[PDB]
Design a protein around this ligand. Structure first.
Ligand code: E0V
Ligand code: E0V
Lengths: 589, 589
């Protein structure tokens, strides 16, 4: 259970972000127990941020292994009357947390929150908070790193990402200290909704620790109570007359206030339905057409780090462009972004960290004993933790189980079936599930056909195939997409695009130019607009972003409609025009 | 024999460049004999120019096969008292020339001149000049095209260059009509020189047609006769007291005036010596250090077409930068450029069209019967024609027989030995010969070791290997170059560089940025500056240039020190500083 920490009448919230001490591990940091004393000969690093781009050092940027963050933690003694909790919104990739040299908790997985109580007896008048952060990736991590997958011997050992984005690490999201009452407090809140005529019934389950009485109340934004049930135990339901539904680009959030003993917590909540029916993706019982992007959490210089002004700018640009949705490629995004999308009416496809589950791009899904991928156990944990964190978001309409796994190979169904079963069991709302499909010659053998509610395709007709032959791209696009269209279920693009360097131009089709980006998209839409079951277009990518170095990466990935500083390329204006003429609902009715 | 056409007291020179009629072949142009009538429904095309980039049409740009050029040719009747000759400085790749529907000549090879007399009886009051131009390349052309070397079927058949520059075709260089006397005229002039104390002896061979008397005279620029021999027949020699030698960056050209019958011709001529001695490249008996580039003939919008303002700009930039030399990668350049280099003092490595002689990047040098490369016969002709055209240029110091052929494979020596023998037999000055060596794991088996006077290496330590690991690049560079340095002969870089998009920057080593280009070069020079036998550095490339489309070509090749419009990147300023501190002679003495 991971409720978003908020300031309430029962809960202090103390942000510990700021300037922290920082030291690269030199191979002796654990042996010499750096976490027991003030870090010596240390640099300074902003928190939250990725550490890789803050300085001008390639050794820092390309570091392999651990780093140590540290700050002083002098807290008011009267907080010891409360339960004191340290929340790490995200530490990428793995973390060990020490208070005063005592290991308090460890965590695997770089993009989901974790927390630990601080034992009263450990707190002294002056305290040290140390966080060791591991950046290493391999066949057991999500995201996956390669291990052995004019030759040269590298100077130093480096991570080998099995994914096309830079391995930004550090204390990515805020660190906060919060409190709750000691004796009785709210642990989790689960809400589902059903529309009966114009009355909405909200089914609640309120998980608590300790012995006390539970109450739930629902308030409009303006502050009018529209439902209240007291001494209700853990499970129950209530009704809202003439409920205002949450709609894409027309958000409405109620305030759900919960009290348990002395503990008080407020959850914003939008009421809406999601259902796949035939070849339709229904939101509030109307056929939606996704218009949007795969994104990244990527800005300069914080890398993956939480950037709230940019989050606000990005949503503003989305609304300027006529988009209604994006996918959290390829990892859960910050709770701050997810709460802003609820507030602004932006639909989200919520994706796990499972990118790179593919050893043949030895078989990927061979037994662990025989060298197959070792991620399934952590993959279940990521699904559990992601749904636990984001289950109550109206903006989340679909779960993406993995990006571009080896789903056309033997064993894939066996790997993914338990994960789809888990996602459907744990999501109280029973939202659609998908995996995002890699382009593949044997696409009719993609195990997504056996598992997903929506077929989400990543296709590069006109870039990675048929480059500079868009007439051939159109023909090959049509041949494959007519297959998917024949299955009768909703399908969409979750990626399609072309690397485009702003400032490069040609009137005559030429890859990497701004004009070719437009013609690439025009050619794809010639096909998709004719296909009844194609219910969404999400470009790759919203904006240019950083990747590992290589001969095909022109200083990162250039498939953005926007540059990294959010300036529109020609194709950004093209999509503003196109999306201005396509309705959010009823385009293909 | 191909003397450069000039206006003389015996020779008219009429430029036929301008706006010509132009038509793509539709598959019926020869069958319907378009060359017998005015071209119907034709476009207009500038001559000289490549045709590919003049319009906005991909079908034109990417055309496969023939096109037809045509213009009217109404010539004064009294030129029929003279011998009338049509000179095509270059038609890329193959040409058929018609006057009034009569085929007058054909030519294979896109970068060297050819000419035909117009029979008096063919000339009418009004005449049509038609030139059919073939752009097709395969295993028999120089440069070589591939034949069979998520798969897709292309919309149209296209050329498949086995080389990294765009296949620009058309009437690349000027078309001119010139005259000579009918009865007796000068066909060729061959000059060699020997320095005895301060007196230069010039050995001449003057090839003529018809019966008349031959005379030779040598004049300073200011117009003073310094030697004259009359009624001298074909071969002879003369002496110049206190001769002024032609030097890199300090040119001096005499004017050699030849008369034969009524025919008169003036040849500019610089006196200088070239010799390889030990690990030294000696010009006028001093150890030269090449500073410069591989170039291309490439400008917008004429493509490969003669651009005399840009030729002057490029030499100016070369002198601004402190360079002293370039290589005519990968084809002979215009005579206009070569004559300007004589006038300006820029040293040239003169290269044939033989790029792409490599079928494994079936064995390249297997018998023609068994599918090996079919270029050796045309390769001999190119060597013959190139040396015939450029033999008298002081600026030409070395012949390059091929760029990046498959010289580490079996049969390579057998292919190249007759060509090196031919080049040494035909060059009256017996200048050094080389081939330009492709980077290759089995570099000790490169047959250049058995054939060349100078080892000319194309190496990309820090780009195509060790990318973003310049410490490893330095180590691998040193290991190989210490081998070449151990052989005791002069060697040099003829290519080394890194794709760099102007405007992309990072303080921390990042491929495609302007800073990485500088660090790439700094790392290579750390090695080359320590190696006694390394006598020259020619970067790839002088300027960004157009290539075929592909995932690693960011709108062409970006390894220029300058952009395509001749603006300096950071590394251009780096080389200005470096070359300002390295002397042309005596750097490694
Ligand atoms: C195992 N590591 C890898 C990966 C990819 C590649 C290599 N090694 S090697 C190489 C290569 N050769 C390198 C040398 N090259 C010369 O250098 C210039 C240049 O490439 O910039 C060319 O313009 C110039 O005309 C040529 O003389 C001509 C081909 N060419 C291309 N594609 C084009 N890709 C690769
Ligand atoms: C036979 N023709 C060729 C030649 C080269 C390549 C292909 N086909 S295919 C492919 C590929 N996949 C394509 C799909 N791709 C997704 O699209 C984005 C993107 O590549 O822009 C990624 O950012 C995003 O995270 C990924 O979900 C992830 C890998 N990736 C890379 N290198 C990275 N090269 C190639």
């Amino acid at each position: 259970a991971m409720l978003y920490p908020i300031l309430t009448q029962s809960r202090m919230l103390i942000d510990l972000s700021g300037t922290w001490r920082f030291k690269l591990d030199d191979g002796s940091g654990f042996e010499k127990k750096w976490y027991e004393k003030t870090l010596d000969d240390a640099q300074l690093m902003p928190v939250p941020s990725s550490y890789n781009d803050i300085k001008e050092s390639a050794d820092l940027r390309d570091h392999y292994g651990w780093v140590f963050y540290q700050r002083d933690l002098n807290i008011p003694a009267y907080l010891k009357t409360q339960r004191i909790v340290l929340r790490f919104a995200a530490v990428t990739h793995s973390a060990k947390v020490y208070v005063n040299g005592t290991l308090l908790c460890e965590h695997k997985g770089g993009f989901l929150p974790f927390e630990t109580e601080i034992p009263e007896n450990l707190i002294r008048d002056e305290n040290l908070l140390t966080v060791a952060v591991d950046n290493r990736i391999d066949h057991s991590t999500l995201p996956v790193g390669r291990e052995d997958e004019f030759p040269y011997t590298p100077t130093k050992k480096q991570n080998k990402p099995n994914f096309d984005f830079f391995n930004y690490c550090g204390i990515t999201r805020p660190v906060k200290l919060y409190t709750t009452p000691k004796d009785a407090y709210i642990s989790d809140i689960t809400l589902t909704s059903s529309l009966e005529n114009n009355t909405a019934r909200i089914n609640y389950k309120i998980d608590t620790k300790g012995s006390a009485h539970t109450a739930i109340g629902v308030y409009t934004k303006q502050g009018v109570c529209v439902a209240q049930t007291e001494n209700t135990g853990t499970e129950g339901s209530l009704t809202i007359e003439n409920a205002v539904l949450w709609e894409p680009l027309k958000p409405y959030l109620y305030e759900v206030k919960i009290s348990f003993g002395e503990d008080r917590y407020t959850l914003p909540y939008g009421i809406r339905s999601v259902a796949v029916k035939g070849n339709k993706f229904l939101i509030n019982n109307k056929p939606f057409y996704f218009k949007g992007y795969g994104k990244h959490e990527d800005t300069f210089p914080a890398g993956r780090g939480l950037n709230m002004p940019m989050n606000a700018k990005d949503i503003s640009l989305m609304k300027w462009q006529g988009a209604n949705s994006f996918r959290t490629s390829h990892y859960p995004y910050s709770e701050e972004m997810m709460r802003l999308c609820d507030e602004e009416g932006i639909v989200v496809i919520d994706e796990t960290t499972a990118v790179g589950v593919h050893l043949n791009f030895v078989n990927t899904f061979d037994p662990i004993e025989q060298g197959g991928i070792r991620t399934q156990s952590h993959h279940k944990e990521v699904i559990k933790d992601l749904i636990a964190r984001d289950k109550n978001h109206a903006c989340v309409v679909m779960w993406s189980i993995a990006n571009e796994a080896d789903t056309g190979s033997k064993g894939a169904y066996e790997y993914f079936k338990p994960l789809f079963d888990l996602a459907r069991e744990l999501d109280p709302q029973k939202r659609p599930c998908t995996l995002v499909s890699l382009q593949m010659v044997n696409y009719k053998e993609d195990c997504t056909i056996k598992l997903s509610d929506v077929f989400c395709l990543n296709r590069y007709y006109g870039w990675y195939t048929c480059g500079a032959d868009l007439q051939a791209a159109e023909k090959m696009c049509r041949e494959e997409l007519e297959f998917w269209n024949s299955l009768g279920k909703p399908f969409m693009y979750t990626e399609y695009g072309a690397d485009t360097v702003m400032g490069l131009h040609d009137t005559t089709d030429s890859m990497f130019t701004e004009e070719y980006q437009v013609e690439y998209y025009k050619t794809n839409h010639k096909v998709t607009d004719t296909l009844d079951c194609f219910i969404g277009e999400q470009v790759w990518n919203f904006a240019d972003f950083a990747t590992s170095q290589g001969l095909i990466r022109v200083q990162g990935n250039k498939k953005g409609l926007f540059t990294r500083d959010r300036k529109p390329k020609l194709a950004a204006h093209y999509f503003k025009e196109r999306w201005s003429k396509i309705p959010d609902f009823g385009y293909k009715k």
